[PDB]
Amino acid sequence: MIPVVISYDIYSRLLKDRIIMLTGPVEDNMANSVIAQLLFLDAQDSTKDIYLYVNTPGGSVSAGLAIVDTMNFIKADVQTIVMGMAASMGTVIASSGAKGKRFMLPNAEYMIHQPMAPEHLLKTRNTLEKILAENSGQSMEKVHADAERDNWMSAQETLEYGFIDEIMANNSL
Amino acid sequence: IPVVIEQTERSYDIYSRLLKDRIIMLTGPVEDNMANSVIAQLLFLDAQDSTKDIYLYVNTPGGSVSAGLAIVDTMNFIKADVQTIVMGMAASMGTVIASSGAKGKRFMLPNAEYMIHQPMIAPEHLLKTRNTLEKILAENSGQSMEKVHADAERDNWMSAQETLEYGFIDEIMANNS
Amino acid sequence: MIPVVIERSYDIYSRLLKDRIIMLTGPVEDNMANSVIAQLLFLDAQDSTKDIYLYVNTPGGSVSAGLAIVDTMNFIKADVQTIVMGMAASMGTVIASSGAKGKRFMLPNAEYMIHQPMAPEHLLKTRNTLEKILAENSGQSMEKVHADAERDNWMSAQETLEYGFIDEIMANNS
Amino acid sequence: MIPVVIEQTSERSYDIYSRLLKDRIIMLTGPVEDNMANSVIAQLLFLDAQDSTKDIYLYVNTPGGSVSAGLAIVDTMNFIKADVQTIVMGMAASMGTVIASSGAKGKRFMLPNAEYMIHQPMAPEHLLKTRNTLEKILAENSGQSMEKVHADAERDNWMSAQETLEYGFIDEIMANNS
Amino acid sequence: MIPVVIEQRSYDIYSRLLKDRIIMLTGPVEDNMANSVIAQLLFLDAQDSTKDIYLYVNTPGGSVSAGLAIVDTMNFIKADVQTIVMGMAASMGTVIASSGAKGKRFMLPNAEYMIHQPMAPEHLLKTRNTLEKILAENSGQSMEKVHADAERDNWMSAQETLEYGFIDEIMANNSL
Amino acid sequence: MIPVVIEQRSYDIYSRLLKDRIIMLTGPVEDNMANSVIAQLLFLDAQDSTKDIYLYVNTPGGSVSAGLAIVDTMNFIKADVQTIVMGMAASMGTVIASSGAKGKRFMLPNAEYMIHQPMAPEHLLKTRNTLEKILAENSGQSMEKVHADAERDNWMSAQETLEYGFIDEIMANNSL
Amino acid sequence: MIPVVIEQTERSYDIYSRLLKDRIIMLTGPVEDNMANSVIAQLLFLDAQDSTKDIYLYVNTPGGSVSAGLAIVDTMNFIKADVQTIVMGMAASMGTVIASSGAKGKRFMLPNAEYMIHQPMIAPEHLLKTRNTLEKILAENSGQSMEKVHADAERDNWMSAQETLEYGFIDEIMANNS
Amino acid sequence: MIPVVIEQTSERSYDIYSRLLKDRIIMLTGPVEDNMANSVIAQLLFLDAQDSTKDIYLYVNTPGGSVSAGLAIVDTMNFIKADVQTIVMGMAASMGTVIASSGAKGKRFMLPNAEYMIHQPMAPEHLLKTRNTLEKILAENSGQSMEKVHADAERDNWMSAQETLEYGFIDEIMANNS
Amino acid sequence: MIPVVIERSYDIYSRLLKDRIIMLTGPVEDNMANSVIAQLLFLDAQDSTKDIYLYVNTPGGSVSAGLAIVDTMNFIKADVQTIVMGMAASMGTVIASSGAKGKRFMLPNAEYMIHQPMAPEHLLKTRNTLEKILAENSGQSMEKVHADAERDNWMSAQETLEYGFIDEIMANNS
Amino acid sequence: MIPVVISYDIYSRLLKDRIIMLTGPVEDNMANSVIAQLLFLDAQDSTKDIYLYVNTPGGSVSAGLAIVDTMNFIKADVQTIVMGMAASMGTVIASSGAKGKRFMLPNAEYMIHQPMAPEHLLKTRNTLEKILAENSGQSMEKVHADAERDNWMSAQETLEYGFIDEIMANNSL
Amino acid sequence: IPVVIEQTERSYDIYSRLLKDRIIMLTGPVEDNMANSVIAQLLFLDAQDSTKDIYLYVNTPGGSVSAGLAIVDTMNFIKADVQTIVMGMAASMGTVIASSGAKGKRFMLPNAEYMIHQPMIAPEHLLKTRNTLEKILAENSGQSMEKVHADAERDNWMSAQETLEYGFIDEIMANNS
Ligand SMILES: [Ca+2]
Ligand SMILES: [Ca+2]
Ligand SMILES: [Ca+2]
Ligand SMILES: [Ca+2]
Ligand SMILES: [Ca+2]
Ligand SMILES: [Ca+2]
Ligand SMILES: [Ca+2]
Ligand SMILES: [Ca+2]
Ligand SMILES: [Ca+2]
Ligand SMILES: [Ca+2]
Ligand SMILES: [Ca+2]
Ligand SMILES: [Ca+2]
Ligand SMILES: [Ca+2]
After folding, report:
1. DSSP structure class, residue H93
2. What stretches of H14-170 show up as alpha helix (H) in DSSP?
3. Which of C74, C123, C125 to probe the A interface (max A CBs under 10 A)?
4. Is K92 a catalytic residue?
5. 3-state secondary structure of K126
6. Which of H94, H101, H102, H142 is catalytic?
7. Tally of CA atoms within 13 A in the half-sphere of A30 that contains its CB
8. Handedness of CA C143, C146, C147, C149 (dihedral sign)
9. Where does chain I have alpha helices with state H?
10. How far away, in angstroms, is E115 Cα from ligand 12 center?
């Protein structure tokens, strides 16, 4: 464990203040840690916001969509904050945050391409694209068309597209 | 392993703090070791208070039949009703487990997927066990065993909507937004 | 094997964190970078008016993670002093450079390397972004930085002060 | 297998190294690299913050290692106003000698059967630059000429405790009191 | 960690013995275990340097450098360090054990002892001379004869070892 | 190489059969074995394209790309390529075997057949459509029904396979 | 490693190919696709050379792959040439199905060889059908009820040359000529 | 398992590929890299030395690979005055397409179920330079605009045999004569 | 899997050796380098008056082995033409460059890289030795070569002809 | 095998003309191949010279000294030719060639440091130094003193020291 | 594996061309596989012509006692005298083998080294075998077995000069220059 007082992580201090770090590739283990943290924070107080910092290259669709259904299901609004990068399921997750409370760091980048029986994979990619469309107010056909490209979007581009609501300040100037 | 502190200064991990609220996390492949943890958790909560419900969240690809069935039998033995919430996916033994949750109280998240195919010592043993898993599946859902046997003989992923239709869950959980 | 101070049982890095010190060591990659960030966010919430002291000793590494440190440093109100010890290369200088003006130090024997190693068009956009940050942090031109960085060229502390990546070289008090 | 020590107060529990850290003892052990160095430097910064007037005891037993990690230790030792004593046990080789010899003057010790080698093993023109730097520190630390240190360092001989006193890298050999 | 007790990481059997000034030096001699041993020796001495220390030794041998750091530390501290050989002591093992406070070096009766030290060649010869010198200082036998006997791979019974001078008493079989 | 004969590397049992226009396609379908098979097919055709070729097939399946290169090469050359299934034919196996000159596709009586083809998803679906199309062309059955039966993991006896249309005759048990 | 021999017409043959000229094939080790495709290759060769001359197939295997074993049996049964079998050392599982499918009257076994007709074994209904087939073949080859072969094949017991004769799986035990 | 072919003369022995090399057939197979390329180029240089007026048949089946190894093949094909025909079988991807499309004009074929992908997977500013080069060759080879090829190459779709005729990378699809 | 021509059974590289062609591929290291040398020594003994054609396609590698090829080329009387195909970097250009004057070719799409990557004083003596050879082979100054080589800079065939590392770019005859 | 006619190496062609390549690290296997080649060439004609090309970083002392005793023992003079480098036992071998017939390529380098029970290793290093002294006409004390350094010698330096007799020409000028 | 061609066109490797001149190369660790090659070579030469000598060059660290002794017994059984030439080193079984060469005809190169220590199933077997190897060593050299046993109980490397003194070889081979 890293910065440790006594087992008591730096991350566990941030959790007292309702913050959750989503970090590294999304696979079942970290997803269930994030999910447990959400059900816990909801149960403590379903009326205070939760702040879900996201920095992931992506990964498992099943685990990522489980975090997402968990997010939607808990009454508490889950703000999301992209830092460094969100790709693959990282964009599905981050964009599914509460409309008006989705943020992003200025130098971070965003990537909505979803790399994946094949009949089923195609269905899943459609559900995933459907969701990015609902999250951005954009048309499904636009998202499908934009996603098949392997282009990274700036925070400015991600804002104009609708996946987020404000880019974080450079409070040093 | 994030950590939650309570004051009066003692220190749970997050899964343990949920267990104080009677939540259990059945996650990853079903094998003996994680199945024992779940079974000990179940026995412990029931003894602590057999009136309150237990909430078993299931996100699993399946795994050993033996270990899954020990989980089922424990859920069925203890007095406390075991709700099951399928998140992510429930494949093979996953569905045997989640569907054996107390009827009226089997939930699934909107985007979870389901799979009742049961992949599989002697061949006539494998048959008996596979009929047994289908036999439980059929009882759980309200369907005939012939029905279950032909639909478990394909690699059909089921949506939550299809899972409710078929009878393995009672309720799709909501999206609040 | 990380030592412990009772005050109740801090590890040596947690103890230094009470005094608002964060250590940044080894290669910059997602996990260590997400740790430094969690400490910065934690420290900013504790007190936004008090300065944070960030020691920096790294060969560099991932642009994504390192640019997450820079942004977090910039996002929080609390000024982030940076102390370079041993070395700072590649992303390490982008981070150390981005300390609050006047509050960027370096130990006498440390070394600096502003070279940034690395989808082709995308790589070229990322390198322009880093060289732009380094120019703003040094009061130098983008053309000067671009030329100095395509050398593999180590810089003493004196040289690094002249360039203006730091503000003060710290003492040899013995 | 790190033994712990129970002290009874108001009951606390230290591993042995952390117990020694209460008496301002740091253990520089094994190869020098970015992690163990970071740990040493953190201990140095802590102790000094507690009390700049009480000394620090750095026991040294290393084959040497990374030049940049070693120079970060050296530079922390010099930056903190607290005097850092060095005690070479077993061996100090290469970066271990630049470290040990930078201990406060008059307070650099070495066990009798320990050994010392000041050779500094090494992109071309940079390697030359750091080697001059390392030899320059070794020279200032021993009151010798850099010319001299350059000659001796390259010849890959080990020095006994006695020879290392004669050279100027330590100030005292600790005794055989038993 | 084994077998353990947590507090009113954990308080294992070696930490409990260490409370009675008992240090256990086992397995091959290398830098990590030697640094643990040296830190234990400096600790105990700091607490009371008029009280003996009991160093149990069971080791195939290993690093000369680390073994000599253990030996010099034993000799630096004013507290006497008794040594007890159990099972085997070989190479740096013997150099370490035979350096126990004179009068207070013991061996178990079926333990075995081997003074052979397997090893740039000018430097290997030099450290070997140091070890053989120390062995002779500890035993009361001449360097020439220590050198002769180490150049062979014979194990020594506790009786051969006491007669040689590396130990002071064999511990008894007390079921007799 | 096995069992071999050197000359008046060596002349192994497969080279000897190849003299009688017999090609053996075995193990998983991958690029190296497929290139050997294609080179054999082009060789034999060049020597005499009016003389049949006998391609023995025993394979779990494998690379679609390589399997389709074997199939197109069979079809390009004017020489008819008889195919004989032995042991098993699965996936690209069946696609390859069922593409034998019509009238001249055989199977051993205890051999087994499996038309399921395990597999960017738009492209995986596309190649799967190609295979299923070919299976239907070779069998005389509809794509719909080929698609239905391939979506299941059932092995087929030589009798089920002849009735389905992938083969033309089952070879006899001649010890009767 | 395996040695070489010359024959006249001036040609090298490895010992196995020399034995092939006498229509002898050697089947040894676990039944898997490589060795089984090699035995089949050989059997096709002999059939192309002369479809009426007898073939002599030596068998020493603990069994293995069902698909590849049945490929051999079927190739043996397809070609009109009588395939004689000689079990040596052991024949177990597919080995007994292979050896017992030799031409009636021409299945042999060495006096200390051992037989074992138990068949161990991807979907489960298919595995059951496959085992029926194997016992069906064993029944035919021995002239016994499938019922009896089922019971006897469950046991996992080892038969001697003489017990293999009594069962009907072989026709003659070969002599000790000393 | 490379079969050999015996021809009787005055008795010689070719592996199948070397036998095909007598008819001026070369097999470009597997990933493109420095070794298999060297072998191809050596075959190209040999055949051409024998007779500059007889054509060369390069069958192609590769996932692509090294750009410099591929461009060495391409440049040998163009340097030798002998016309090199290309036949894509199975697949040609990436460097395999730059190679195949540089076959003599009118003599570039492709099997019906084969597939073609002209995406060229990629130190920064150099990678841009070679990608322009590769697209420039692809453009000249297909009579298309480079703008066009740049658009289509980056979109990572596969092309059927028919589509590849429509594009200009081949001249003929070989038939299903059976 | 190296093809064969009967003439009695040459492998494709031995057959080309009858025509005095040697191929130089992959990384330059002791074993392949000792092979090329054995071929050069063999070919020189066969006829010292006839030219040898050396094809060169390599990323570079060991200085010792590569400098053994250069010396062997220089030691034998028979002129050694060098044909660069694909690429020649680092030691590969020292070798290709050292072909006989007028007889140093390059295929149109090949690339050149004169950078030479690498006991510190010794490394610096070796790099001066290589840069000195490259200067003599190109008719350029040691200062020019030294500056151009500390870039990581790929050269087209045109650029390489201008520099004077080759004499002719060979045709695209299609 | 490399440039192959028929098993028949490029190296085996050079051997018809009495040339032997010594290459890679000297260990027992390659040493016994070199030794077999020497006894063969001696037996064919003990009056024609043998040409031993050497390019080795060094290695096993026992195997290297076996090549050397073999060289001295066969009546035929063994010329040696250093190319690329000779280090450790490579210098013992190369320098033990017939006095007046030891050659070296102009850019090759040479290294007489001999890196190695310790009492025995020291004896072996002395025998090795003894031999380099006999081979160069230099004093043993000079060789010992020069060898403990890890310095590489030029062909010019190696000539002035006496380990060789002529540096090969650059016949391109 | 360099190759030698003879003309009348047939092609030996170098070790095989030496074998035509009755030379055998016992090299590397003594194990069963290389020992068989040597034994086949020995049997083959003796049958071809039992009057001419065989020249066994030995450069070996030692190895299996079993396999070495099979080599010795073959050298001693066949009629043709087996000269042995120690080059590089001869340790353990190496020395048992080389010293069992036909007396008068055991050679060693000037710089070769020798080692009769024999490093070593049940302990009383190891003893019998070790006495047997010493017993052969003693017979070979002309020394008593007590002598051999105490000198084989050290890690003494022997020079050629010491090896001639002691009796394991007949002649140090010359340096011509
Ligand atoms: Ca919510
Ligand atoms: Ca809301
Ligand atoms: Ca219940
Ligand atoms: Ca700030
Ligand atoms: Ca003491
Ligand atoms: Ca004494
Ligand atoms: Ca056809
Ligand atoms: Ca049809
Ligand atoms: Ca038959
Ligand atoms: Ca020349
Ligand atoms: Ca000679
Ligand atoms: Ca002479
Ligand atoms: Ca004899």
Report:
1. E
2. 16-21, 34-50, 67-79, 95-101, 124-142, 146-153, 161-167
3. C74
4. yes
5. helix
6. H94
7. 16
8. positive
9. 12-18, 30-46, 63-75, 91-97, 120-138, 142-149, 157-163
10. 52
Experimental method reported for this structure: X-ray
* Stretch (H or E) spanning C22: strand C21-25
* 3 state SS for F39-80: HHHHHHHHHCCCCCEEEEEEECCECHHHHHHHHHHHHHCCCC
Residue ranges of the alpha helices (H) in chain D?
A: 16-21, 34-50, 67-79, 95-101, 124-142, 146-153, 161-167
All structural domains of chain B: 1-177 (3.90.226.10)
Collapsing DSSP to helix, strand or coil, D124 comes out as helix
Q: How far apart are CA B117 and CA C134, in angstroms?
A: 58
Count Cβ atoms below 10 Å from residue I128 Cβ, excluding itself.
12
Instruction: Specify the amino acid at residue G76.
Output: M
* Inter-helix orientation angle J118-136/J61-73, to 10°: 40
H or E stretch at E97? helix E92-97
Distance (Å, whole) CA H102 – CA H56: 13
User: Which tokens go with G171?
Assistant: 């026709």
- Give CA–CA dist C68/C30, Å, rounded: 9
**From the candidates E64, E125, E129, E151, which should be mutated to test the interface with J, based on the most J CB atoms within 10 A?**
E125
| Angstroms from C6 CA to nearest CA on chain H | 51
Q: Name the closest residue on chain A to residue H154, using Cα atoms.
A: A149
How many C-beta atoms lie closer than 10 Å to residue H177's C-beta? Answer: 10
Helix (H/G/I), strand (E/B), else coil: B13: strand
Report the distance separating Cα F148 and Cα J88, nearest Å.
73
- Burial profile K20-43: b = 16 or more Cβ within 10 angstroms, e = fewer: eebbbbbbeebeeebbeebbebbe
Q: How far is CA E45 from CA B91, G79, G106, in A?
A: 63, 91, 90
**In angstroms, how far is CA E165 from the centroid of its own chain?**
14
Distance CA K132, CA I25 (A): 57
* Ligand with smallest separation from the Cα of J75: 11
H119 is catalytic: yes
- CA distance to partner chain E, nearest, from residue K19 (Å): 41
What region does I21 belong to: left with phi over 0, alpha with psi -120 to 50, or beta?
beta
Distance CA F37, CA A65 (A): 46
Task: Report the C-alpha gap between B15 and B4 in whole angstroms.
Answer: 10
The Cα G80–Cα E144 span in angstroms is: 88
Cα–Cα distance, B74 to B65 (Å, whole number):
14
The tokens for I89 are 């970097």
In DSSP terms, J23 is beta-bridged to J55
C-alpha G73/C-alpha F110 separation (Å) is 9
8 Å CB contact between B37 and B6: no
Q: Which residues contact residue A44 at a Cβ distance below 8 angstroms, ignoring those fewer than 6 apart?
A: none
Q: How many CB atoms lie within 10 A of CB H63?
A: 17
Number of H helices, E strands in chain A: 7, 6
At which residue do the structure tokens 């079809």 appear?
A: F75
Q: Between the CA atoms of D59, D64, D65 and D66, what dihedral angle is there, to the nearest 10 degrees?
A: 60
